[PDB]
Design an enzyme around this catalytic site. Structure first.
Site, PDB file in Angstrom:
ATOM      1  N   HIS B  77     -47.250   8.301 -45.744  1.00  0.00           N
ATOM      2  CA  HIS B  77     -46.676   8.414 -44.431  1.00  0.00           C
ATOM      3  C   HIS B  77     -45.529   9.413 -44.324  1.00  0.00           C
ATOM      4  CE1 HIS B  77     -48.461   4.642 -42.230  1.00  0.00           C
ATOM      5  NE2 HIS B  77     -49.363   5.306 -42.911  1.00  0.00           N
ATOM      6  N   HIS B 244     -57.188   4.171 -50.355  1.00  0.00           N
ATOM      7  CA  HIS B 244     -57.663   2.797 -50.097  1.00  0.00           C
ATOM      8  C   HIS B 244     -58.415   2.227 -51.280  1.00  0.00           C
ATOM      9  CE1 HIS B 244     -57.077   3.269 -45.431  1.00  0.00           C
ATOM     10  NE2 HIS B 244     -55.925   3.353 -46.094  1.00  0.00           N
TER      11      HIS B 244
HETATM   12  C1  HEM Z   1     -57.924   7.622 -41.558  1.00  0.00           C
HETATM   13  C2  HEM Z   1     -56.808   7.646 -42.254  1.00  0.00           C
HETATM   14  C3  HEM Z   1     -56.116   6.369 -42.492  1.00  0.00           C
HETATM   15  C4  HEM Z   1     -56.027   5.179 -41.797  1.00  0.00           C
HETATM   16  C5  HEM Z   1     -56.385   4.879 -40.376  1.00  0.00           C
HETATM   17  C6  HEM Z   1     -55.256   4.275 -42.594  1.00  0.00           C
HETATM   18  C7  HEM Z   1     -54.849   2.941 -42.200  1.00  0.00           C
HETATM   19  C8  HEM Z   1     -54.134   2.063 -43.017  1.00  0.00           C
HETATM   20  C9  HEM Z   1     -53.664   0.715 -42.562  1.00  0.00           C
HETATM   21  C10 HEM Z   1     -53.882   0.333 -41.108  1.00  0.00           C
HETATM   22  C11 HEM Z   1     -53.064   0.155 -43.591  1.00  0.00           C
HETATM   23  C12 HEM Z   1     -52.463  -1.204 -43.548  1.00  0.00           C
HETATM   24  C13 HEM Z   1     -50.990  -1.192 -43.192  1.00  0.00           C
HETATM   25  C14 HEM Z   1     -50.537  -2.611 -43.454  1.00  0.00           C
HETATM   26  O1  HEM Z   1     -50.976  -3.498 -42.614  1.00  0.00           O
HETATM   27  O2  HEM Z   1     -49.806  -2.941 -44.441  1.00  0.00           O
HETATM   28  C15 HEM Z   1     -53.201   1.124 -44.717  1.00  0.00           C
HETATM   29  C16 HEM Z   1     -52.803   0.874 -46.015  1.00  0.00           C
HETATM   30  C17 HEM Z   1     -52.758   1.757 -46.994  1.00  0.00           C
HETATM   31  N1  HEM Z   1     -53.187   3.053 -46.932  1.00  0.00           N
HETATM   32 FE1  HEM Z   1     -54.069   3.895 -45.396  1.00  0.00          FE
HETATM   33  N2  HEM Z   1     -54.959   4.798 -43.774  1.00  0.00           N
HETATM   34  C18 HEM Z   1     -55.412   6.006 -43.762  1.00  0.00           C
HETATM   35  C19 HEM Z   1     -55.303   6.912 -44.765  1.00  0.00           C
HETATM   36  C20 HEM Z   1     -54.596   6.796 -45.975  1.00  0.00           C
HETATM   37  C21 HEM Z   1     -54.426   7.841 -46.970  1.00  0.00           C
HETATM   38  C22 HEM Z   1     -54.709   9.315 -46.858  1.00  0.00           C
HETATM   39  C23 HEM Z   1     -53.762   7.241 -48.014  1.00  0.00           C
HETATM   40  C24 HEM Z   1     -53.247   7.745 -49.303  1.00  0.00           C
HETATM   41  C25 HEM Z   1     -53.651   8.770 -49.990  1.00  0.00           C
HETATM   42  C26 HEM Z   1     -53.629   5.801 -47.674  1.00  0.00           C
HETATM   43  C27 HEM Z   1     -53.152   4.864 -48.549  1.00  0.00           C
HETATM   44  C28 HEM Z   1     -52.874   3.515 -48.145  1.00  0.00           C
HETATM   45  C29 HEM Z   1     -52.489   2.516 -49.078  1.00  0.00           C
HETATM   46  C30 HEM Z   1     -52.113   2.628 -50.492  1.00  0.00           C
HETATM   47  C31 HEM Z   1     -52.334   1.347 -48.345  1.00  0.00           C
HETATM   48  C32 HEM Z   1     -51.997  -0.006 -48.825  1.00  0.00           C
HETATM   49  C33 HEM Z   1     -50.638  -0.439 -48.559  1.00  0.00           C
HETATM   50  C34 HEM Z   1     -50.152  -1.665 -49.259  1.00  0.00           C
HETATM   51  O3  HEM Z   1     -50.756  -2.079 -50.291  1.00  0.00           O
HETATM   52  O4  HEM Z   1     -49.070  -2.206 -48.811  1.00  0.00           O
HETATM   53  N3  HEM Z   1     -54.228   5.604 -46.463  1.00  0.00           N
HETATM   54  N4  HEM Z   1     -53.860   2.215 -44.311  1.00  0.00           N
HETATM   55  O   LIG Z   2     -52.293   4.569 -44.601  1.00  0.00           O
END
Ligand code: HEM
Ligand SMILES: [O]
Ligand code: HEM
Ligand code: NA
Ligand code: NA
Ligand SMILES: [O]
Lengths: 713, 713
Positions: B77, B244
């Site tokens: 982010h 993810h």
């Molecule tokens: C279409 C693009 C993306 C969408 C819509 C998206 C959406 C989300 C959402 C909605 C969460 C949950 C937030 C929460 O409720 O804690 C999340 C978690 C996460 N995303 Fe994404 N994401 C995207 C792309 C990315 C990218 C590019 C990365 C990293 C390279 C990423 C890595 C993470 C990780 C590691 C989590 C887990 C967080 C945790 O364990 O607390 N995401 N994402």
């Molecule tokens: O994310």
């Protein structure tokens, strides 16, 4: 574009502390305006101004062939924004050329006056500021028309962006009182710090209060607003009658003919505003205020005809051509000249607010005395015009040029000349050691020096430790200054001083003003020593001690701190959150956000709090100069909650045990909450920051000690 | 408190040019972050970061005992606000810690992540910026969990206030498209410069477009936004699937339990936000986005499970416990671990936007290849994560520390190393004389060097004269660079260069990049001589020429100026007024308002306008460096009006005769209209200011010529 202010309209605004950066200033960082002005040929500028007075431009033709009345109004409005409550407003920064003042309705057509002055500004360049030129031009206008001014001082440096001033909360220009953002409450009580009755007015509504044409009621508004601009009854009568001896108002047709103010006008207007569709839109057809009054039979010459007319006629309520209420002399002949047509004459006219000078009983007495003794009127007007136009210039040391009046005026908070040798660095060291040997504590020394120096405000450059007025009425009795404590400290310092001065030769001596500052320096050095750091706090001697007789006690009242975050002090419960008042105080002290942050954190651990409050004293080594405030504030092992007894006081408890560790106010905790302040607190609370914290504290302490030292400028 | 912005919401905001002043910065004006970083023990920081991963704090307990996923999202982010349109956003200033980004809904609970890092930040102090630490932490999270990163560069200096960025015009957080301030129009066209589908989101809505759970339509939004963040389909699939692979989303109960974001929370929250009333408010009960999805069977370890699950099941639409749309694997066993309770397991789940990677036909092919060849997936994700996180850092010369990848990547707009002796001052004099003898005019020389140097933007530190990319596709064909004229100049310069280099010994040569700039310097010298002034323009050699193959033509497209007030250029008619676009361009060039003013006024008289337009050329001695622009602009003898044919072009006519004297655009006239800009123009249009104007022009010219010279930093 949606901004942080839109999303979080009550978060604190720090940008007010970061104005006036060298980035926004087009002059070199070496430019010294005083040095440029001291080489100006002021006589030549005045000769050019004199010629301008009768050189009409067809884009804004001069009434009666003479611009004098217009330029008098211009200078009067430049000064007339001043408020004693915070020292904001006034002529001292040339803020009439910027928003919002350039577009206030009461400043309509002063855009034309300022534009008339561009050729002279262009000619003399950086050697005369717009701020000085505005005032100078009002002087020359008065001189050119036969009035002897009391004098003129240059030295108002130009500014390059708008000042952040609270002008009121109304969202509608000139809104009548009683709306959702009313500046009035109770029995026509005007909210501090305001000094005008309606948004976009200088003082009062010339038709009467909220438009009601009653000269007796209007007189109340006059007296209240003028008092809030530091003018008493005699000065007020002299100013209004003096000004309205000249020129005319402009109301030749309906106000709906007048277009957008300068900040709303189209780019092609090139900074001008109020373009009028009424006939030629200027000159004989001008519309400014909407009123159409010409006060005297010789509008381009000093006379005593204003009072001859005010008292020589009875007055009838009538309407201008724009529909505004105004007054005409009953049964009079057409004796007043027309501004453009030599074949036309008019009856005497007056504003409701002019008539106040006759129908208010206390003004009537003064007006009569000025009518019977016009030389008294002329002297009062000269003195008041000087005061008005110089009120925010600061100490006499800042006054430049060959027309500065020699008379010292009580309103200037004068400081006596020093006529003896000053202490040197070895003497300063000997005094610091004697102060520390007396048994005065770090807390007492720091609190006393802070109390004396922190009355300074950069708005009008009043206050500061110069004068030693902390020992005088009323400062010695302000609750924030802890009158009994203060008295015991001053008594000890005065004994040290007497002993030091009695031992000298050569006429060397130290003022109490200097010693108070020096003693606070010793306190800061000792605090640093208590923390294990050897520092020398800078000190510049040369302050002098003013007398009670050279101190206007009533004028001094507006400098009383009712809120001083730096001592965790609030005199009562206010509508404005305490953190907002902290940043307001920081702005008056001329501090940046980093400076504010360092200084607050230091003062807390030095024992500067009024009453020895423990609020924000987040250290176990009080009176040692450390960064403990920041390290302890930022410790996520403590949880904070507001108290049951007081939502404005917070307890910090150990997260794990529940044990009570600290208490603080909003002023303390904002440094852990506001995202920009907490980023500053993090720098000073880091492991690598103890030496930086001490250095940066000493520097900001010294800055505060020297805020009024224009003798060393 | 009613402000200028409230009264005149469309006047221009110059405060954007005066940010980052040394007033707001708590470090000394000597502090050099790169030097502090170079001394950091980076290995020690990383060992602390490794320990933190599994050191759960009770106030925000770690999912699965490991904060890795949360920190990966935090870093993602931080980088994920970047827009290629203006280069604004990105991780490079640590702006996640300030408003508004600290309080965006998509950044919910990242306040917890940042606070978990405070003790590390505190320990290392100024030697590691928050900006660097955010990214470092994401790298360490990936390494901790088994994924080898491609590299890491330090050198992101911290900033001290919020960046002025246009994030859209909506007045409601997360407002769906089609509202009164819609960022969409036509066939789902997102307005430039925005790169997110809703106010307060990073890229796309994880439920689908405007909340509609269609993975194919969602894929369209993914592709458009990610392209606007510089990522192609392969990089996008790799980033999403890579990210993810770890962690989980948080949606344990209804969103109505979640309280104020950090900028709206009470002071006692000490900078944190989104306090939740749902059960314990944290850990097993966390609510962040409202979705409740865990992607892999080992959320704390790198695996190839994301694509095994995506392809291995069919998916059914369901709702989270907060009511959000998400997908569950049809008929699957409970194989995914719970974050807190070892006795619970869950079925595989996916977001709509995850399923986009399978149901969009072009992403499907990439996803399948990554599923079949996981080594390819790993390397793509490592490269893309490096790009994402370093995209805004600027030339390779700025990259600090021992983990910088040695591989030179196309996206870095690389500049070849200089491997020969540089030209010296005698050589520079010889080349400037050859340039002036060639017959090239002041206009051509100035326009060409301006075109080359002015592509720089400080937002992402792309562009500038280094590389001589002006001679390459696509710069050589931009309309603003006057392709035909440019070609002629470059041909003459290339001939000069060839002749000079052929005459040397010892391997000395001059790059064309240097010569372009040097020739512009000669043109400025000549212009000063034409005005009677003896001026040497500083020049620093050392630029190198990049090749076509080192210049990604599609990436370069976003640098094309569609508006450049400094050449009076506009590519089409836009909804944003041209003067707003000028100040935007000045901000990208790193100019203050006085700089912008001087520069513009000089360029106008030097013949830098595209097409040799006469708009704003207020001089009768074009190609002489004078302050004529200012003196003539401010002449009240001229009246201005918009033309009948075009409201954006203005005619200035003699007030007395009606005769046409000049024409100008909004960009020209704003200097005569805006009250702060006209105060600047007045300084340069004064009688005492000719020498100052020349000197200040040469200084700002030189500044612009050196904007990308981080090799000399
Ligand atoms: C279409 C693009 C993306 C969408 C819509 C998206 C959406 C989300 C959402 C909605 C969460 C949950 C937030 C929460 O409720 O804690 C999340 C978690 C996460 N995303 Fe994404 N994401 C995207 C792309 C990315 C990218 C590019 C990365 C990293 C390279 C990423 C890595 C993470 C990780 C590691 C989590 C887990 C967080 C945790 O364990 O607390 N995401 N994402
Ligand atoms: O994310
Ligand atoms: C109660 C206080 C005052 C009120 C309500 C007031 C009101 C006004 C109004 C409404 C105008 C007409 C503006 C126009 O239509 O052109 C005006 C003109 C003028 N005022 Fe005042 N005034 C006050 C005090 C002052 C003072 C203190 C001075 C100067 C010492 C001053 C000097 C003048 C002059 C010279 C003009 C004539 C301008 C011209 O000839 O263009 N007034 N005043
Ligand atoms: Na003031
Ligand atoms: Na950026
Ligand atoms: O006035």
């Amino acid at each position: 574009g949606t901004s942080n202010r839109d999303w979080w309209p009550n978060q604190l605004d720090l940008s007010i502390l970061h104005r006036h950066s060298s980035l926004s200033d087009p002059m070199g960082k070496d430019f010294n305006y005083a040095q440029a002005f001291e080489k100006l040929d002021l006589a030549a500028v005045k000769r050019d101004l004199h010629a301008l007075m009768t050189t009409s431009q067809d884009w804004w033709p001069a009434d009666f062939g003479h611009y004098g009345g217009l330029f008098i109004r211009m200078a009067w409005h430049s000064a007339g924004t001043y408020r004693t409550a915070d020292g904001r407003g006034g002529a001292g920064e040339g803020q009439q050329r910027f928003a919002p003042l350039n577009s206030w309705p009461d400043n309509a057509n002063l855009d034309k006056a300022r534009r008339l002055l561009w050729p002279i500004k262009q000619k003399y360049g950086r050697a005369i500021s717009w701020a000085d030129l505005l005032i100078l031009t009002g002087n020359v206008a008065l001189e050119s028309m036969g009035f002897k001014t009391f004098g003129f001082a240059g030295g108002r440096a130009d500014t390059w962006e708008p000042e952040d001033v609270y002008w009121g909360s109304e969202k509608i220009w000139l809104e009548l009182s009683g709306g959702p953002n009313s500046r009035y409450s109770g029995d026509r009580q005007l909210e501090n710090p305001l000094a005008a009755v309606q948004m976009g007015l200088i003082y009062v509504n010339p038709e009467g209060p909220d438009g009601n044409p009653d000269p007796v009621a209007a007189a109340r508004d006059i007296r209240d607003t003028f008092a809030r601009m530091a003018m008493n009854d005699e000065e007020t009568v002299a100013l209004i009658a003096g000004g309205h001896t000249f020129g005319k108002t402009h109301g030749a047709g309906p106000a709906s003919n007048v277009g957008a103010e300068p900040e709303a006008a189209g780019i092609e207007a090139q900074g001008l505003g109020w373009k009028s569709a009424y006939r030629t839109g200027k000159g004989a057809d001008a519309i400014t205020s909407g009123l159409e009054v010409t006060w005297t039979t010789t509008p381009t010459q000093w006379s005593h005809n204003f009072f001859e007319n005010l008292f020589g006629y009875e007055w009838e309520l009538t309407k201008s051509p724009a529909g505004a209420h105004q007054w005409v002399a009953k049964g009079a002949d057409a004796v007043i000249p027309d501004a453009f047509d030599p074949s036309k004459k008019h009856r005497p006219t007056m504003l409701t607010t002019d008539l106040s000078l006759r129908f208010d009983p206390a003004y009537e007495k003064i007006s009569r005395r000025f009518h019977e003794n016009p030389e008294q009127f002329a002297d009062a007007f000269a003195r008041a015009w000087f005061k008005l136009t110089h009120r925010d210039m600061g100490p006499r040391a800042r006054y430049l040029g060959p027309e500065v009046p020699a008379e010292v005026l009580l309103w200037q908070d004068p400081i006596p000349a020093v006529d003896h040798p000053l202490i040197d660095a070895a003497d300063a060291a000997e005094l610091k050691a004697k102060v520390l040997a007396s048994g005065l504590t770090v807390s007492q020394l720091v609190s006393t020096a802070w109390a004396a120096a922190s009355t300074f405000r950069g708005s009008d450059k009043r206050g500061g430790a110069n004068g030693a007025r902390i020992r005088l009425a009323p400062q010695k009795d302000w609750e924030a200054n802890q009158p009994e404590q203060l008295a015991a400290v001053l008594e000890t310092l005065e004994a040290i001083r007497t002993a030091f001065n009695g031992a000298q030769r050569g006429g060397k001596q130290v003022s109490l003003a200097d010693l108070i500052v020096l003693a606070g320096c010793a306190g800061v050095e000792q605090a640093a020593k208590n923390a294990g750091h050897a520092v020398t706090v800078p000190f510049a001697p040369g302050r002098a001690d003013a007398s009670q007789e050279q101190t206007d006690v009533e004028s001094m009242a507006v400098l009383e701190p009712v809120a001083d975050g730096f001592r965790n002090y609030l005199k009562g419960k206010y509508r404005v959150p305490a953190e907002v008042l902290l940043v307001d105080k920081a702005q008056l002290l001329t501090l940046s956000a980093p400076e504010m942050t360092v200084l607050l954190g230091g003062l807390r651990v030095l024992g500067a709090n009024v009453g020895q409050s423990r609020h924000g004293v987040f250290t176990a080594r009080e009176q040692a100069l450390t960064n403990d405030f920041f390290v302890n504030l930022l410790d996520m092992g403590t949880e904070w909650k507001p108290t049951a007894a007081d939502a404005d006081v917070f307890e910090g408890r150990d997260r794990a045990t529940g044990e009570l560790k600290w208490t603080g106010t909003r002023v303390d905790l904002v440094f852990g909450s506001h995202s920009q302040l907490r980023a500053l607190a993090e720098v000073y609370g880091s492991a690598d920051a103890q030496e930086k914290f001490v250095r940066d504290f000493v520097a900001v302490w010294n800055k505060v000690m020297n805020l009024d030292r224009f003798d060393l400028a």
